[PDB]
Amino acid sequence: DQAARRRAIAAELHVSPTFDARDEAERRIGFVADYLRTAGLRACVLGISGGIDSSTAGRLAQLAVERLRASGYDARFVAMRLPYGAQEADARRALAFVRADETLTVDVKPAADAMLAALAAGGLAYLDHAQQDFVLGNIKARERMIAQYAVAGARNGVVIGTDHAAESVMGADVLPLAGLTKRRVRALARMLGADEPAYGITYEQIDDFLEGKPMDDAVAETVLRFYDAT
Amino acid sequence: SMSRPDQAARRRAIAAELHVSPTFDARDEAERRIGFVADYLRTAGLRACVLGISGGIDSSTAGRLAQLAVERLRASGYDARFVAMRLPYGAEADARRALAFVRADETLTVDVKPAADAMLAALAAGGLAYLDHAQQDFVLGNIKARERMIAQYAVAGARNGVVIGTDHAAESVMGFFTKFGDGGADVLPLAGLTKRRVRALARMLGADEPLVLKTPTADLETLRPQRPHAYGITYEQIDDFLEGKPMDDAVAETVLRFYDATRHKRALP
Amino acid sequence: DQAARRRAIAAELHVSPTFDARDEAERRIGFVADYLRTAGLRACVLGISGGIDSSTAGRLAQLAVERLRASGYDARFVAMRLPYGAQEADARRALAFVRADETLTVDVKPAADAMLAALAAGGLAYLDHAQQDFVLGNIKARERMIAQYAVAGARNGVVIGTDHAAESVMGADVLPLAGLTKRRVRALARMLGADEPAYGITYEQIDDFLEGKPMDDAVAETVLRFYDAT
Amino acid sequence: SMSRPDQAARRRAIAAELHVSPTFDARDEAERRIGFVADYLRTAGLRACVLGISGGIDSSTAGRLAQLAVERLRASGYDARFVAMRLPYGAEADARRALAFVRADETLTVDVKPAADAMLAALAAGGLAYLDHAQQDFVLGNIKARERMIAQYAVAGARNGVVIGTDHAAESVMGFFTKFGDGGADVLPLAGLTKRRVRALARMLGADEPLVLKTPTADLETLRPQRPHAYGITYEQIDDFLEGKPMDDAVAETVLRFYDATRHKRALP
């Protein structure tokens, strides 16, 4: 009788039991468009990492600002490459798909290393070096968010987030991927025309869980454990 | 919309939304905000909390509350600690005095100027450039506030703790005007409070008036709009608004407009 | 740690922890007005029993149709006396307060007695006579609803209900008393200008429960029992 | 609203709202609608359920399902009974045949004409009067449907049972057009079904085609508007709509309008 939660989580996270990509694309392009218009905004901003989630969110946002400009409402989408130093063809590939109004590249390593260094000089100490790497990984992710806010604010714009339901379970201002599962993000991208680039918990298992797809009992119990354990 | 609620009615109502209570007693709001912090820590498993101490009264107050909460936890037997952070932007009297009042288990001083300056330069390298003195000021302002949040999260990460935040209801309303973000914290012991209520809480906690009055640049910068004309609201007008005190009608109408424009964007989806 | 439900029920039933009568009156008059307008309706309908709940709901509805007519939108409120035979000054008193556009009187006894009689002739049998009285009480209440729908339908109108939160707990189309407690219904009427006319569970106890008013522990436990037991 | 969802998309979506599944298998929708009725009864403590048998297929089907549910309950050991009601308006072949198919534990015949006629007269006495032949027809129509619901509730009251209802998704959509109410029932074993799906369920339950085809006046009256020009929708158009089958665009656009106008009034509050 646990199946009660599963369905309770999907609804709370907004996962619909059916999915049509065309329908969703249209809906989400409009969300973004209405949002910027209603709020009197002129731009939106997203870091493009080469990952499918930001590729998808970003293409929706480009299409949104294009739909607005057709409206007579002016708006631009600013794509950001945000490397940690000289590490990159995946993001370029993503860029070639997103086709953003603008692309800025901002190196976050100097800020991230300067923060780590100041922490140390300040007497923040780690039992293990691995722990320092974990701390730095999070600094990097946050520095990447700062760069995006910096541009959104200077430009009277907002930051796009890549949040979705599969992500909430497993793992900005405007979230056009809300309610989606992982395979549904992938399918939305495919239909927009993209090419074709945990504790043992997988996205398939999470997607099944959230999707109502009849799946093994044990496994389900498993996914519910991990989620509650968070 | 054949419905035309009175401004006083609209204020009621926003206030409940934000958790501003009709009456306020400082003595036991203190008692209860403490316990809240404590209970949250155990209930989560956490052993530490962290806060940047700016020299300004909200951080002084949230800070002191956190130090009393861990001091309590201990008594309950459940070990835990509070890390205050001093977070200068290079080379402050206000902060040192606040620290003296907070009396944290532990204080780390972390310079955010190198990180802040590096982010600004890399942004300019990347094309957010040819900023005039005020545009750079405004950009630098947000960066510094968010770099400070990064410092607190790192420590919190390192120590299996959480970041104490200073958010309150008056601050939320200010945010309708400014749109200043810093990313947020984990636990908000000042939630529901107005600006004068935070000051009253602090006096109950033993803060002296000089401490109450301190306004560091780091707090002042957060009251500015995103970029550099802006309707100038004061916290005193916001407090009067939320507390339902007699005040200026035009002023109160402005605040409604701003809350309205915000209420929508949250509707969308 | 049960206080969890109490607050959960009040929210689900829509009870606000504060209350201003003027504010509520205004809000509820507008609800009714918008409703009839948005739906292209021309009338609304309520049985006036002399009880405070229907007095209150009805006066709000009269004020609503008056606010619409000031708008240039035409609408009428039809008050109904619905006696069970020659039984009545309480309803007349209520009527004098409601001041409805129209008042119809419809005797429900003949329909109610004809239904009871047909049931009997049909072989519906009761172990006790008391049980027949209970069955008839419900027939009467339902016949009263039919009379109201009959008029709402013939007139392109709708039926006003008297539902509120205290009522849901303890015990139409448009419900202008939704979210209210019993003492708040009484206070709304007082301010509109009305004169001044269970298993041991009372309205005070329910109102306290739903209102967050700090009240005795036991009692609270009691009210929660009765509600769940339903 | 920079969002312009496709009609096919809008149909998807309404359909899920109403619980019309994408595929339908009659054999096990039957199995599962039965169990549902049963489990509801125990879970509530109830020992009886009741339904007016009109001669028409929705009541024939909901009826049969109820009789199998109690027959099951018994097996589960948990005693219970089904009371079918024949509810003539005075002085019908359709109903008697339906009853023969339902094979209820028990049947009561209750004449609703005396009650209906008494309500109409008292309404006229009270001022709903000088009705022309069609206005009286339309008024009488609602009264009769609701008097029938009263009969079922009385029995249900008397027997610590619940009233089985015939509501389904196609009926809900019809209601956007007609606005016909009867007050509702307690347990809706046909919920989520379209009109053709109810017919398919009935055939699975063993109904013969002649039974499937019967349309008593009592069912026909429920498809009319409140008063006596109305856009004429058919159940076949509604079914095509909800099931997402190829169909007329104009037609489907009408149905959207009507569902829209309804979606709002429910928003208000």
XYZ file of C-alpha atoms in Angstrom, chain B residues 33-39 41 49 63-74 80:
22
model
C 13.400 31.053 17.657
C 16.181 29.565 19.557
C 14.441 26.253 20.100
C 13.520 26.250 16.433
C 17.100 26.387 15.342
C 18.051 23.660 17.759
C 15.263 21.312 16.866
C 19.600 20.720 13.728
C 25.690 26.044 11.716
C 24.073 35.207 15.004
C 23.416 35.516 18.726
C 20.313 33.310 18.356
C 22.409 30.666 16.743
C 24.999 30.729 19.438
C 22.333 30.316 22.082
C 20.739 27.543 20.157
C 23.902 25.429 20.075
C 24.597 26.327 23.621
C 21.194 24.872 24.355
C 21.631 21.841 22.177
C 24.601 20.970 24.071
C 26.890 20.996 18.025
